[model samples]
Target chain A: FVNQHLCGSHLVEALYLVCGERGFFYTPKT
Target chain B: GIVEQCCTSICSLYQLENYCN
Candidate 1:
């Protein structure tokens, strides 16, 4: 998936699905 | 092992790789 490309892998997978990308649930790099 | 290890908090890249599965 695109997440693998970004190298975020697990976090990116969790993003939009569990963590979110840039909304109220936006995740920080920490 | 890690139980509550989600792709958040400690799972962030900044926390290092041990948190990953």
Candidate 2:
């Protein structure tokens, strides 16, 4: 699902929110 | 502006969760 693919750390999730506003989306690694 | 550098960076980290390029 799209939820599985995101744009970040918590930062990624933040980015996803922004990107989604434009067009995009991670639960990234360290 | 939606600068996608973060997306590509996350992709590189091999988190297996984000898109690259």
Interface RMSD of 2: 11.3
Predictions in order: lDDT: 0.34, 0.37
| DockQ scores of the candidates | 0.10, 0.08
Give every collision pair in model 1: A16-A20
Per model, the share of native interface contacts recovered reads 0.02, 0.07
lDDT for B14 in candidate 2 is: 30
Error of 1 at B3 (Å): 20
Best by lDDT: 2
